Amino acid sequence: GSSGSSGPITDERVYESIGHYGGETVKIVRIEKARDIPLGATVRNEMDSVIISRIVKGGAAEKSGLLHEGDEVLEINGIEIRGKDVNEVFDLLSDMHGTLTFVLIPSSGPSSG
Numbered sequence: 486g487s488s489g490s491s492g493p494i495t496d497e498r499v500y501e502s503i504g505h506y507g508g509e510t511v512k513i514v515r516i517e518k519a520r521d522i523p524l525g526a527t528v529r530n531e532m533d534s535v536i537i538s539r540i541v542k543g544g545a546a547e548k549s550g551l552l553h554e555g556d557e558v559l560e561i562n563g564i565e566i567r568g569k570d571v572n573e574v575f576d577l578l579s580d581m582h583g584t585l586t587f588v589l590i591p592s593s594g595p596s597s598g
Contacts, residue, residue, distance in 0.1 A: 502588045511559060512556075517584045518584075519582060520583075523541075523545065524546055525540070525541035526545075528571050530571055531557070534568075535558040535570075535571065536558070540553065552589070555592030556591060556592060561585055
């Protein structure tokens, strides 16, 4: 015999997170975290998303200033976050080190206060 497949072969979606997400807009922010540098950014467990809860001072998050309260984490370095757990997310970064590509959406909620 002799034949291929032709069509949607395997999962051709692992070439690094892409900016253009479905029908929305994600914000990419590269944060540098030493091999012994904490994140210093708290996050809450949203319905099914990992949003920021608080920002710690002296943290890689604050330092770089690419993470703010209300930011929703989706992918980090390619790894999914949406659905994950705070601990998981933390255990992830904590495990990871260096310039990580954080793909989150800035909650630019309009409201003067």
